[PDB]
Symmetry: C3
């Protein structure tokens, strides 16, 4: 048992800002979002997924200038969560054996829901 | 394990477009939505449910049927390719929940194997 | 069991003392009142209660315990609690989110 939800306004992601993007998204993530019909929506969705996933872990919370590059969404095909660094340790350290995530958006906002297994 | 989410703008469903409705909704689905206070919201909700459900399987949407009765959780009933690919993935059950406000509808589904 | 609920932030009238006090526990009310956006907070807890009820498959009965830096916990009472045991529901988890427009909550129940 673990569940997480995250909703983001599409305009919360500034795509121009290379520093922020590259800082928070893995290369496979950035390449995926860039290839989408709406790049900004795509980043907003992946961002929601990262947040939703972290929430489903239920761990010592995060915060600026903490980064979410740890939590990777691999959309290669249903999404896949792959954890790294602290994210990964704290997940094993909580007994979390798997995380699943789904993502959606419309014109207004993006939503992501994650469920964790322990 | 399996989760799906889908969000739709209420105005993505044109209730007037008989072709589209008839192509994507089963007769009982159509009857249910039609009997609701807000028909367009109802269709947008059932549509989100179908999308969410398909996503939770991890594999036209008339195959995925949502059987709703107000005051009782919706039920998912799969058909055709939807059904095969679900058994073919080991999916033993799918649950769905639906909601909307003035702006949009959201649905979340979880699948079991 | 799964439940989702989405609410417009403005669906909660904080000036409606009757509704607030009828639907939220004192802990709940105290929590929401201490937040940066009180109305968003109430809208979020409200979505959670609704989401949780849906996941049971069967609202002051359904209480959401919130403290910052932590995931919410569901604690059931009264009829809510009986009907949950009476359904074999062994645990309920909930997550909450909002933006400027609306709040969303998703709950999953165990049997």
């Amino acid at each position: 048992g673990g569940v997480g939800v995250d909703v983001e306004l599409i305009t919360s992601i500034n795509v121009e800002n290379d520093t922020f993007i590259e800082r928070n998204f893995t290369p496979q993530e950035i390449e995926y979002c860039s290839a989408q019909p709406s790049v900004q929506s795509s980043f907003a969705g992946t961002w929601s997924a990262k947040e939703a996933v972290f929430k489903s872990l239920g761990v010592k919370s995060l915060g600026g200038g903490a980064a979410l590059k740890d939590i990777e969404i691999v959309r290669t095909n249903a999404p896949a969560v792959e954890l790294h660094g602290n994210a990964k340790k704290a997940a094993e350290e909580a007994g979390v054996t798997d995380v699943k995530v789904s993502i959606s958006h419309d014109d207004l906002q993006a939503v992501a829901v994650a469920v964790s297994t322990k």
